[PDB]
Amino acid sequence: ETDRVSKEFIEFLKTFHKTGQEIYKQTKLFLEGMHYKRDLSIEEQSECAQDFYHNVAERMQTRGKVPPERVEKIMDQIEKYIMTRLYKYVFCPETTDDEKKDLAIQKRIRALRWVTPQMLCVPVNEDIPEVSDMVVKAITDIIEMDSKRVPRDKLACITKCSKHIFNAIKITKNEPASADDFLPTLIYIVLKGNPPRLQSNIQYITRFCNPSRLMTGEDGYYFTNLCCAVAFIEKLDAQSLNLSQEDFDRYMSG
Numbered sequence: 001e002t003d004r005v006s007k008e009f010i011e012f013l014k015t016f017h018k019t020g021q022e023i024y025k026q027t028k029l030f031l032e033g034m035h036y037k038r039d040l041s042i043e044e045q046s047e048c049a050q051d052f053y054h055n056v057a058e059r060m061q062t063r064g065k066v067p068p069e070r071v072e073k074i075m076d077q078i079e080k081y082i083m084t085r086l087y088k089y090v091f092c093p094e095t096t097d098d099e100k101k102d103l104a105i106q107k108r109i110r111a112l113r114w115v116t117p118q119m120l121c122v123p124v125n126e127d128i129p130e131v132s133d134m135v136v137k138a139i140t141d142i143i144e145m146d147s148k149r150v151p152r153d154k155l156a157c158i159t160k161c162s163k164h165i166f167n168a169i170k171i172t173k174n175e176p177a178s179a180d181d182f183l184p185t186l187i188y189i190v191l192k193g194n195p196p197r198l199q200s201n202i203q204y205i206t207r208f209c210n211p212s213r214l215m216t217g218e219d220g221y222y223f224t225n226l227c228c229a230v231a232f233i234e235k236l237d238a239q240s241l242n243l244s245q246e247d248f249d250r251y252m253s254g
């Protein structure tokens with residue numbers, strides 16, 4: 001696969017022949033350097049990648065007189081390339097509590113399989129085949145996030161998931177979904193899906209995705225909601241589900 005990305009990257013840079021070859025050298029040198037920084041904290045490595053993005057984006061416009069309109073495409077090609085290559089080294093580092101967190105969240109979600117959409121006031125009626133299918137399609141995308149290496153592709157999965165969510169809500173209510181309808185539905189989808197390495201995926205995106213795509217409202221709104229969904233689940237309690245500590249503890253055990 002990576003060879004496919006390398007070919008696509010090299011072929012893509014010839015398109016800009018002049019500046020292209022230059023960017024390729026800079027990119028190859030950045031990776032060579034990251035090899036020597038493998039032992040640093042994931043935060044610092046994230047900083048090297050974030051700086052690399054910034055510095056290369058400001059080196060074309062100037063030295064290459066490249067149109068600020070074509071830059072975006074290029075940057076996406078660069079992220080695809082380097083992240084496709086760093087993935088094995090920066091995703092869920094043994095040097096972080098990423099794995100311990102993936103496990104706690106997984107165990108946590110697995111212990112909450114008794115939580116119903118009703119308890120969460122979720123505007124989703126799975127007794128309606130169409131809605132049920134929307135729900136499973138949503139889960140599919142959230143789960144497939146883990147199989148993607150590039151942060152942008154991981155984001156695309158989150159977006160595809162949320163779009164199935166809105167249709168599930170639309171069909172159930174027979175009208176457009178309200179603002180307050182989303183988050184509860186996403187929490188439900190995550191509870192029923194228990195997405196692989198949820199915490200590692202969230203951190204990876206936050207660490208190596210071009211920040212320009214995370215708080216711009218586009219995929220940023222969806223990403224923020226998923227983080228908010230995980231946090232909601234982490235601290236979910238009796239009152240949270242609209243119950244008395246009594247009931248809650250009953251379910252949680254028996």
Ligand SMILES: [Mg+2]
Pocket residue numbers: 137138140141160164
């Ligand atoms: Mg889909």
